[PDB]
């Protein structure tokens, strides 16, 4: 059957490419036009979290919107107090090659992983007063590129072995394995309900997953290069993906296709991270060229800039109550914007 | 002061974490970090054993200098995504087997990997302590199997004189940054532990040429 795929699979991907054109009667940038812009957005650096000595590759807020963990390439994981820039914890890592960290929604745990191929879970509310390694979740064959807690006993990791995996933290066993991608999974993102999560890979595709069924429910492809970052719209019914080709895109889960594209000709650098503000009107994007643009999400206009870094903005995050934006960069400084 | 009794003890905790981070970084600044690369068949596994799954660290203190050597052979991912993690190593020990010119698409593939990391944007200032492994096996491989099989344009001897040194010119010619990078080639002896000596003498030259470049004295 033409090496047993093109008989239907190459035309079945034209049924899809013809269904996604039937349902595109008008684009987002046509119906969401003649509405007021957001005006220029001057966010000033309200904080500067100093104390990492190597590059900061990952950052993640706690749900209380005050504490945030950050992982740098020195074997340290710092839990910051963002209001008063104190260091609550500084957690020494067995492996120094951290590429991702995550804070539990209960605030009791933090996770960490990287080139060691392991996601370590750290217990923060120990009775001894220090932070112990509550668990080491091994089983991926590639570097862990992103981890995210579902609760204190479920964490979805994603790896450079083209695979995402749900985990049971009490045991050390991955109860589901998500095996759709043909490239390195570089980033995942839980839906606000924690029943769906999207993942983006170096094969320029993002896949919607179902945490229970374990099945790739949808697949999105608009980019020409690797998807470094992916974040759900706060509704849970769209997400934005930033890639190496300097373009963010807003994909629509119910319409099952790309709604908009956030590009600019002065921009040529990859996108390291991406994130929405609360209400999802602003799309923040951490670029390779030291900046962090602020895209009007419903329109497509860059309605601001956060140009306060002296190196690649490796990770940003919008606090869960919407107050502030934290950005890390390979210069060892977390800046809390607002 | 507007700091409560507990807001002040939380800042004393913060400043005591600050010194352990400042101190624990000074303790890991005394250590020279070395990426270890090369198409791994026989050479990379022996040089870390010559000196004593995702990343493999290897400590060896030679002459009051603590070395860390990061072997990334067992990663097996898109190298372009994690290679920037190693931006800032002192040097890149690039192990190579002279016994792969006749295995000829292997020696010519190691030259394809050397050209990939030697010309990254992340390694424009990182020298390369290029080892050439198994020059004993390159002795008697040429005794039957000559050169020119992996290098058709090689118009020269076969007596190991211009034989080996024609390898050493092909790699060092692949350096596209002759100004901001210095390849330090060595033919690994394997009967002596002067391999760590060459690493030590090639790292003290990288550090000094960084120090002189740090203070702008060049």
């Amino acid at each position: 059957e033409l090496d047993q795929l093109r008989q239907e699979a190459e035309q079945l991907k034209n049924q899809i490419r013809d269904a996604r054109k039937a349902c595109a009667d008008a684009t987002l940038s046509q119906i969401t036009n003649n509405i007021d812009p957001v005006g220029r957005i001057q966010m000033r650096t309200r904080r500067t979290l100093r104390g990492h000595l190597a590059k900061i590759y990952a950052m993640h807020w706690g749900t209380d919107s005050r504490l945030l963990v950050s992982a740098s390439q020195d074997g340290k994981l710092i839990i910051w107090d963002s209001y008063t820039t104190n260091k609550v914890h500084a957690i020494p890592l067995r492996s120094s090659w951290v590429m991702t960290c995550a804070y539990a929604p209960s605030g009791n745990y933090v996770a960490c992983g990287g080139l060691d191929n392991i996601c370590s879970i750290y217990n923060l509310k120990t009775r001894e007063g220090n932070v112990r390694v509550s668990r080491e979740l091994a089983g991926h064959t590639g570097y862990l590129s992103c981890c995210r807690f579902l609760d204190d006993n479920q964490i979805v990791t994603s790896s450079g072995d083209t695979t995402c995996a749900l985990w049971d933290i009490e045991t050390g066993q991955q109860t589901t394995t998500f095996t759709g991608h043909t490239g390195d999974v570089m980033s995942l993102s839980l839906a606000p309900d924690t029943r769906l999560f999207v993942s983006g890979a170096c094969d320029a595709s993002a896949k919607l997953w179902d945490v229970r069924e374990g099945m790739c429910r949808q697949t999105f492809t608009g980019h020409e290069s690797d998807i470094n970052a992916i974040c759900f719209f706060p509704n849970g019914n769209a997400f934005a993906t930033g890639s190496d080709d300097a373009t963010c895109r807003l994909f629509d889960l119910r319409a099952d296709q790309e709604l908009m594209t956030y590009s600019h000709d002065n921009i040529i650098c990859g996108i390291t991270s991406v994130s929405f503000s609360k209400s999802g009107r602003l799309l923040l994007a951490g670029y390779d060229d030291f900046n962090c643009n602020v895209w009007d999400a419903l329109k497509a206009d860059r309605a601001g800039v956060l140009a306060g870094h002296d190196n690649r903005v490796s990770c940003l995050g919008v606090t869960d109550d919407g107050m502030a934006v934290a950005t890390g960069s390979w210069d060892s400084f977390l800046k809390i914007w607002n | 002061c507007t700091l409560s009794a507990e807001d002040k003890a939380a800042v004393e905790r913060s400043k005591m974490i600050d010194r352990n981070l400042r101190e624990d970084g000074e303790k890991a600044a005394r250590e020279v970090k070395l990426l270890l690369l090369g198409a791994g068949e026989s050479g990379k596994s022996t040089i870390v054993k010559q000196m004593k799954t995702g990343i493999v660290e290897t400590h060896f203190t030679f002459k009051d200098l603590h070395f860390k050597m990061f072997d990334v052979g067992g990663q097996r991912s898109e190298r372009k995504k994690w290679i920037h993690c190693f931006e800032g190593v002192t040097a890149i020990i690039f192990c190579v087997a002279l016994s792969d010119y006749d295995l000829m698409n292997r020696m010519h593939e190691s030259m394809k990997l050397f050209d990939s990391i030697c010309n990254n944007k992340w390694f424009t200032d990182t020298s390369i302590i290029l080892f050439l492994n198994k020059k004993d096996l390159f002795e008697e491989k040429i005794k039957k199997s000559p050169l020119t099989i992996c290098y058709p344009e090689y118009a020269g001897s076969n007596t190991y004189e211009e034989a080996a040194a024609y390898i050493q010119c092909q790699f060092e010619d692949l350096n596209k940054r002759k100004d901001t990078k210095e390849i330090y080639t060595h033919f690994t002896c394997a009967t002596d532990t002067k391999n760590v000596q060459f690493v030590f003498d090639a790292v003290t030259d990288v550090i000094i040429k960084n120090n002189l470049k740090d203070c702008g004295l060049f």
Partner: single-chain antibody
Amino acid sequence: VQLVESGGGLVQPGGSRKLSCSASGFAFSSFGMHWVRQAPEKGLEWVAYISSGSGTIYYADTVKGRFTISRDDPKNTLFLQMTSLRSEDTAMYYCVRSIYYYGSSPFDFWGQGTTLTVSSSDIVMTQATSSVPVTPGESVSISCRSSKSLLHSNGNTYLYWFLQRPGQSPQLLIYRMSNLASGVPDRFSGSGSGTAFTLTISRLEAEDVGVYYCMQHLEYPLTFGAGTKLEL
């Protein structure tokens, strides 16, 4: 986790002893260490404080020059050097571990206490009640007024509720306010705002019996309210 302190006993006035509390079971270096005195058939009284790293030491005005708190982190021991012991220093001296960061719970663990029978401006915590009789299954309310608003400008009101069962060391029940210490039954609840505070017990049990102290941790010295005993 355990704090076992020995030393003391009987001492003739003007003498000197060396109390020591040998911590074991936790990161002793990370914890600030209080001493909390309890005179015979009386209330709790803060004595000394040495923070983690020893970079801070506070004392009560009563012992400002006579007592010397000091800690041996490699040995995991806290010391109290007493000089010129007066008769008013007779008490059971508890060693208390307290760790301070955003969201922590100071005073969460109390040593069993070492007795010391000597021979022979400040926040005032007022809970003038005493011997509130009740039977199990009942809902009890306890209050203690502060001479100053314990609500600090940063939102934290620094009121701690302790429970000392008969023959035990005190137990942390509620830190800053309405924050239930880990390991405490959730029937306890803490309420208040400003200078009037209430410890509400939803359904009293057979173990919820003993003196209930409240403490201000707003500024030093640390003052405990007098005991509010609950006898059934």
